[PDB]
Nucleic acid binder design. Structure first.
Lengths: 493, 59, 34, 329, 56, 55, 171, 64
RNA sequence: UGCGAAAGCAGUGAAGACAAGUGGCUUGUCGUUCGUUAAAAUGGCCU
């Protein structure tokens, strides 16, 4: 004998712009909290090590939000101009902030009262400050002096390297993630310059010619970096020294980029980019950097980030706009006497020679239409089909199982005026869609074939048939004019 | 229900044996018991999972 | 079939092919343990 | 401790007679050691206080002689399941060892008495006892053809006995514990080994000098020597088998084992060998698979390495697949 | 060198006679019911009930 | 029956018992066969739906 | 020596039964495994051990028939709606009786069962019955090799226990 | 395959046998097996019979 | 039924026996034959 096979739901052929698994995973980042800061949100970074906090740079205050309650836990207010950059060290133990007076203040994270040191950098506004990703005691600060600097945080009076060689307004650092001597800086004349630090340092070793003024440059692999500026980002192999992808799928300038790797996602790695036009979009660097999902906010999105690869908790996506406000979207994750009497129920047989296992795994609960079909209650299967909140493919699949399995007239014998109205009341909506219209056709065909005299007697469904005729007329007008458009597309062959 | 609750009565005389179980026989909370059909051999299993075995030397 | 033979099916569905003291004690003990 | 009390292969090594306890009554079963050529039916002893001390095969309907502990040798036919005859000494002392040569059967007593029965006459010929040999528990008849001269008894100290004069003709320094095996190796050497020691010693039966001393690495339980003294396979207390290869040639006085075989399961569980049997080029080891059922293995021992381990299939977590059902149930 | 043979079996071929309902089955079980003897039109298959394999 | 058994009767020599209730059928239980009598066994002999609503 | 001193149990020992002929002891408890021990005084060694998952046995019983004394089933049951019969011949061949043949309302568990013999009494053919104790007053008696419902004995009140008396008649 | 308990008229069903039943009979001494014949009427081009015994214990097809 | 495509194109009786209703008559049926390429007994599926 056999188990009785389930009733299969009616899946009709698929339609364009369906749900890819990548956009399913990204679309379940919900409950977008908004926070009105005072000024344009220039920069936002995350804690690395237990990556559960993110520092948001508004003007003259840096706010560490936490990723369990999405509120400000800690705040840094004691700046003297507009604060520009805020980044956690690679271990998360301390936090650097670049200022509009050239005063890189590094505090310790999770204590805003102890300014650990204060670097008096160049006289122009320092705009980007971040620690080394491999090292833990050099700090790269680039300013509006067209020179980036590698300070040692023991000797914060003179820089351990002073990376000159630029011509206009350096705004971005990155480090190369395997070779820790290699600093990829980016300025407002394209020209992602990058430096080996063992050498002199006043001359880049090679220069990657982005055309437009770059706004950000990150490094994805040990071998390829992604620089964004103008309408496009361009990805560059460092070894082959060669641009090998570009995307310009935005309207306005790409402001910022970041990248996640091997986090729990169908997309193995993700590059999300923020582009001044409301849109922040995610690209998949495995299938040639194609876009997969995107969000749209209420202004020019000026900076964006996501919670890092080892977040292990509430997974966050934050975008700070230039309007002065910030949007966060998350995905969320008897007695001793009695037990001593009833002891061994947790055993599962480690030391036991034979192990028998015949306990059937309990399946899904059968719905009302399925169990009525399995007990051969066909009129009751129809009654259970036409309940209010039922799924439309479920109503379609029980109409298909009644039609194919048995006989629609058998399911439709004992009806009258009040018990035929749910069927035709669904047939009004179901004659629209193409997945359902043929089944609605032969169902209504046999019901008028069986109930002709009630169309005389009962006037409650005469106008139901009239309005059904109107809907059939509407959809046959569309189903002829679509054939006309098919013909005038065939002419264009 | 309680620890060491087992008695062997001798019938026809219906008089309970007085020398076993004594206060130091490790019956435990006696939850099952079986005599063997041939050798005259008690097996008493208790709540902590220990079948203790006695041999009734008369047989 | 894929090893240089050809198989056919009949109408009475038969598939076909075209192709290129000691032993005394031992026996008595095994008969007594049977 | 192992549930099988007594075990002995027959000569030719194709049946194992083994005495176990089955719920306070001992029972004697006989198993064939290779089925390619389970036996369900035993001989149960009736009393709970009667028990088999020693057992030996006769070679001619095949039968066992079970020296009991009430002073009776039961001669038991294996093809029926009844005892054919009960030889009875006149006393009630447990009898410690028996040995046969032809139709002649010798048994030792625990009153230190020697009894001779003729298995053809079914009668007690001769009853005697000898001075200065007083805790005997092993005797072997030294094979002298049709003549049944020269018994050889052991009491923690072997002594060679002329029976027609009824005296001790040579005495051998045995062990410090009682002797457990005492066997004739050629027609001039004999091996001897004791309860709870791992040193066998082979004596010359004409001079008295210990030729060699064989050292197992655990306490020797039983031994079986090949038919021409080129091999001695001792089964030890930890359940290993140790083959001394040609133990009578020039490791000058004390020789270790040449080959060592043990059995493990697929789990890692070492199952112990009891009572194996060696012959020319083919060795038969035996163990107990369930609680009391003997399983066997014929190993060609001349081509296996020195340190060897069989890996047998013994159930430890095997998911019970009924043949009427695939894996998904 | 091309020769024709037949190797594999067919239908178990019960009593296809009319007027006999009920016992239209020829197949038997042994007395020590370990094997199931079922005819075909081509061979007499003896299956084994313990292991579900045709044994002879 | 499928629901309650509202009323039931027997014949003279107690070889039949008829019974009926709210599931509008009448069941007849028989003890006529001499094996059924000497074994004192009743059998659900038959069943007739002849009524409209109840009995 | 303690009979399961060889292989320890992992629960209470709810059921304990000797074999009728062989020197075997079957123990079983709520750790849903049942262990057979070849017993003697010296080393009570574990013959075998079967772990029926998710089915915690309350009562287990060695059964052998009068027809050949070569059946040797083991019947086990606990607070589940099925019973197991492990056919012994030394993988394991077990069958699961889960059909009450129409009487499932009056038997919600198989816990209190006993095994007994019964004659056909138109032929002189014995077989085995298992007698389950049911809810109302019922004892549902059913065949042991085929699982069919044979008869049912209802008492009044609350059934608590029962037993089986045999009495001879003739040859 | 229905089997009728003839005392109280109670059926036990075996419902999906992938062939119609054209013979069923109990087989063993104590009635442990049921031998059945399934006629498999889906293809009408041929009369092809699946032979089936099954054991009465759990109603699993021993040796189809 | 034949032919074909998934459309369609061509083509559709006699005896014997029994029952019922009024030896005859009339109808209906067939675990009867020859020829032609030729809906229903309250009765539905396991744990």
């Amino acid at each position: 004998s056999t188990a009785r096979p389930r009733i299969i739901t009616s899946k009709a052929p698929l339609l364009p712009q369906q749900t890819t698994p990548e956009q399913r995973y990204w679309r379940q980042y919900t409950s977008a909290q908004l926070v009105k800061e005072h000024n344009s949100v220039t920069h936002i970074s995350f804690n690395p090590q237990h990556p559960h906090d993110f520092a948001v740079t508004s003007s003259t205050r840096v706010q560490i939000f936490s990723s369990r309650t999405r509120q400000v836990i800690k705040t840094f207010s004691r700046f003297k101009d507009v604060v520009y950059s805020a980044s956690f060290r690679s271990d998360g133990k301390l936090l650097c902030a670049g200022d509009a007076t050239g005063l890189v203040s590094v505090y310790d994270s999770y204590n805003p009262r102890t300014i650990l040191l204060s670097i008096n950098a160049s006289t122009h506004p320092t705009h980007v400050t971040k620690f080394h990703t491999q090292d833990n005691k050099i700090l790269a600060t680039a300013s509006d002096d067209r020179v980036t600097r590698l300070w040692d945080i023991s000797n914060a009076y003179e820089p351990q390297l002073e990376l000159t060689g630029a011509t206009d307004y350096v705004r971005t650092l990155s480090f190369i993630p395997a070779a820790p001597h290699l600093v990829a800086t980016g300025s407002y004349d394209g020209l992602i310059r990058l430096y080996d630090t063992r050498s002199s340092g006043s001359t880049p070793i090679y220069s990657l010619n982005h055309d437009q003024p770059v706004e950000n440059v990150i490094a994805v692999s040990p071998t390829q970096i992604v620089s964004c500026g103008g309408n496009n980002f361009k990805v560059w192999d460092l070894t082959s020294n060669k641009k090998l992808y570009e995307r310009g799928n935005f309207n306005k300038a790409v402001t910022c980029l970041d990248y996640v790797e091997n986090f729990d996602s169908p997309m193995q790695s993700a590059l999300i980019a923020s582009s001044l036009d409301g849109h922040v979009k995610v690209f998949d660097p495995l299938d040639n950097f194609q876009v997969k999902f995107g969000w749209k906010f209420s202004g020019p999105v000026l900076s964006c980030a996501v919670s890092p690869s080892t977040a292990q908790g509430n997974r966050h996506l934050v975008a700070g706009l230039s309007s002065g406000l910030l949007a966060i979207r998350t995905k969320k994750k008897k007695s001793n006497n009695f037990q001593r009497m009833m002891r061994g129920s947790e055993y599962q047989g480690d030391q036991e020679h034979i192990i028998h296992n015949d306990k059937v795994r309990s399946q899904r609960r059968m719905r009302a239409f399925e169990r009525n079909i399995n007990q051969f209650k066909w009129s009751e299967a129809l009654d259970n089909a036409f309940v209010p909140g039922m799924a439309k493919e479920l109503t379609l699949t029980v109409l298909q199982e009644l039609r194919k399995r048995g006989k629609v007239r058998v399911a439709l014998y004992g009806r009258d005026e009040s018990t035929l109205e749910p069927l035709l009341n669904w047939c009004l909506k179901g004659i629209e869609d193409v997945r359902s219209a043929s089944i609605v056709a032969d169902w209504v065909a046999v019901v008028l074939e069986l109930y002709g005299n009630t169309l005389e007697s009962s006037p409650v469904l005469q106008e139901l048939m009239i309005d059904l005729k109107t809907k059939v007329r509407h959809e046959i007008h569309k189903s002829k004019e679509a054939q006309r458009i098919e013909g005038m597309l065939q002419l264009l062959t | 229900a309680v620890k060491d609750a087992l008695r062997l009565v001798h019938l026809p005389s219906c008089s309970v044996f007085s020398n076993w179980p004594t206060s130091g026989t490790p019956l435990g909370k006696v939850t099952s018991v079986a005599f063997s059909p041939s050798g005259g051999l008690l097996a008493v299993g208790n709540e902590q999972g220990k079948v203790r075995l006695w041999k009734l030397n008369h047989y | 079939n894929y090893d240089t033979d050809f198989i056919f099916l009949d109408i009475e569905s038969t598939l076909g092919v075209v192709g290129t003291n000691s032993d005394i004690f031992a026996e008595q003990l095994h008969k007594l343990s049977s | 401790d192992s549930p099988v009390l007594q075990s002995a292969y027959d000569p030719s090594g194709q049946y194992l007679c083994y005495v176990t306890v089955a719920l306070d009554k001992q029972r004697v079963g006989v198993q064939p050691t290779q089925r390619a050529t389970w036996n369900e039916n035993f001989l149960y002893l009736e009393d709970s206080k009667l028990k088999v001390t020693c057992l030996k095969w006769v070679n001619d309907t095949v039968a066992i002689i079970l020296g009991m502990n009430n002073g009776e040798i039961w001669l038991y036919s294996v093809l029926a399941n009844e005892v054919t005859y009960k030889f009875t000494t006149g006393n009630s002392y447990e009898i410690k060892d028996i040995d046969l040569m032809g139709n002649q059967l010798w048994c030792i007593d625990s009153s230190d008495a020697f009894y001779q029965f003729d298995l053809l006459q079914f009668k007690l010929l001769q009853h005697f006892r000898i001075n200065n040999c007083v805790q005997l528990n092993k005797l072997t008849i030294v094979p002298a053809g049709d003549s049944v001269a020269q018994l050889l008894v052991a009491s923690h100290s072997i002594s060679l006995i002329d029976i027609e004069e009824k005296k001790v003709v040579m005495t051998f320094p045995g062990h410090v514990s009682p002797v457990s095996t005492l066997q004739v190796i050629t027609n001039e050497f004999f091996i001897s080994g004791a309860e709870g020691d791992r040193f066998l010693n082979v004596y010359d039966i004409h001079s008295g000098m210990t030729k060699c001393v064989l050292v197992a690495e655990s306490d020797i339980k039983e031994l079986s020597h090949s038919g021409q003294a080129d091999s001695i396979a001792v089964t030890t207390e930890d359940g290993s088998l140790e083959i001394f290869v040609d133990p009578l040639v020039s490791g000058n006085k004390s020789k270790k084992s040449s080959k060592k075989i043990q059995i493990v399961s697929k789990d890692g569980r070492k199952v112990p060998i009891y009572n194996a049997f060696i012959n020319k080029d083919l060795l038969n080891v035996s163990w107990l698979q369930n609680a009391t059922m003997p399983y066997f293995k014929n190993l060609q021992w001349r081509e296996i390495p020195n340190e060897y381990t069989v890996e047998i299939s013994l159930n430890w977590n095997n998911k019970n697949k009924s043949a009427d059902r695939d894996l998904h149930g | 060198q091309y020769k024709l043979s037949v190797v594999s079996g067919g239908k178990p071929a019960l009593n296809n006679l009319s007027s006999v309902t009920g016992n239209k089955n020829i197949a038997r079980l042994s007395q020590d019911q370990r094997n199931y003897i079922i005819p075909f039109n081509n061979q007499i298959k003896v299956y084994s009930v313990e292991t579900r394999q045709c044994v002879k | 029956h499928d629901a309650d058994v509202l009323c039931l009767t027997t014949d003279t020599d107690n070889n039949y018992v008829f019974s009926a209730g709210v599931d509008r059928k009448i069941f007849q239980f028989s003890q006529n066969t001499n094996k059924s009598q000497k074994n004192n066994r009743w059998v659900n002999s038959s069943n007739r739906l002849l009524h409209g609503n109840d009995i | 020596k303690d009979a399961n001193a060889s292989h320890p149990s992992h629960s209470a020992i709810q059921s304990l039964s000797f074999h009728p002929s062989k020197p075997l002891l079957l123990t079983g408890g709520y750790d849903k495994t049942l262990r057979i021990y070849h017993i003697d005084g010296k080393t009570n060694h574990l013959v075998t051990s079967l772990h029926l998952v998710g089915s915690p046995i309350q009562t287990c019983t060695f059964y052998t028939s009068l027809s050949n004394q070569n059946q040797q089933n083991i019947f086990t049951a606990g607070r589940r709606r099925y019973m197991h019969s492990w056919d012994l011949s030394l993988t394991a061949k077990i069958e699961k009786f889960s059909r009450l043949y129409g009487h499932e309302s009056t038997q919600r568990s198989f816990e209190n069962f006993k095994v007994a013999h019964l004659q056909n009494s138109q032929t002189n053919s014995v077989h085995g019955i298992v007698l389950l104790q049911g809810n109302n007053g019922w004892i549902n008696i059913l065949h042991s090799t085929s699982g069919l419902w044979l008869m049912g004995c209802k008492i009044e009140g609350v059934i608590t226990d029962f037993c089986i008396d045999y009495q001879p008649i003739s040859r | 395959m229905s089997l009728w308990q003839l005392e109280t008229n109670s059926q036990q069903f075996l419902p999906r046998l992938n062939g119609i039943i054209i013979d069923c009979q109990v087989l063993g001494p104590q009635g442990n097996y049921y031998s059945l014949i399934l006629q498999m009427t889906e293809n009408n081009s041929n009369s092809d019979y699946q032979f089936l015994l099954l054991n009465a214990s759990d109603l699993t097809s021993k040796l189809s």
